[PDB]
Write a structure and sequence with these properties.
The PDB classes it as hydrolase. With 330 residues, this protein is mainly beta. The chain has helices at 114-117, 144-148, 229-236, 307-310, and strands at residues 3-9, 17-23, 28-35, 41-43, 68-78, 84-96, 99-112, 124-127, 156-160, 167-171, 184-187, 196-204, 210-218, 225-227, 243-245, 250-254, 262-266, 269-273, 279-282, 289-292, 294-296, 303-305, 314-318, 324-328. The protein has a 7-stranded mixed β-sheet. Strands 2-3-8-4-7-6 form a 6-stranded mixed beta barrel. It has a 4-stranded antiparallel β-sheet with strand order 15-16-20-19, with no helix packed on it.
Amino acid sequence: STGSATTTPIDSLDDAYITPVQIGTPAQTLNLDFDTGSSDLWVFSSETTASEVDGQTIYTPSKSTTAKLLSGATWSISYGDGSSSSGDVYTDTVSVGGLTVTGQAVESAKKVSSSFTEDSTIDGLLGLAFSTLNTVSPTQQKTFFDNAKASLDSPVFTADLGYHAPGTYNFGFIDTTAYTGSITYTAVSTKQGFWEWTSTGYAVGSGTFKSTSIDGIADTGTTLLYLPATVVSAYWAQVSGAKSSSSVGGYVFPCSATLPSFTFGVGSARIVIPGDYIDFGPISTGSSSCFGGIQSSAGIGINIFGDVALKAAFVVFNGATTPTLGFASK
């Protein structure tokens, strides 16, 4: 089997991407944030505290003839941005782009933190990291990809995120028309539960490539590119007037600037992030200070190849017995 679904930016900045997902019988379609940095499929629901729902579409398990309470199971998750959610668990039928999994754990939110409430466009998350990170207790549950894998034509999914435009998540096949050149594959460590890999270096604009190992994660659920402070300083030093602002929470730059590109290495291959992809717009409405899309990872504990980086590539998440990642230009 295969599946193919379009993923759409939630706003004009590509702050996140939503993909429609069918849950239950008859189908209830929710727009979920596909997140290769986490491993829970959770949704706003009829059980979510009413004051914490503000415009999201909810899953109502009592209206699904295939929903079953997973007795005794609870979940609770906290994300790197400080947001969180928790609740109980159903199993139900879940389909993405024509690919159907029966018995998928659908984690129903009883509580969500303010940033979820305040974002009316995201109805939940669909985790695509390794199932060892799934938070369901006392019986850990498998991700949608893990459940689908054996049925797929090939044990892979691909992320093809657009810049200010829709893109595609495919399951079970590699669309050879969706990228240019060849796909360069690189080793993955699953020891932290992430799609963790080592970039071979970077360049800023037309500058020379610096060969240096940068361990980080391919994370579709993180907006920006978070890299070591040395790398980030080298980037922003090429932008007149750019500075790190403790009050804003990162590097800002004059909105009048033209940003240089940023290149990252995948083995001997190179992925070029155009400068425009690094512009996240005014820090507040009407400001002439703009927020940068490359930020320091120094306070995180891990480097994160988020959407800013991934949207410059066609990315293969290869879930073979020994997982690997593939990157192609497009």
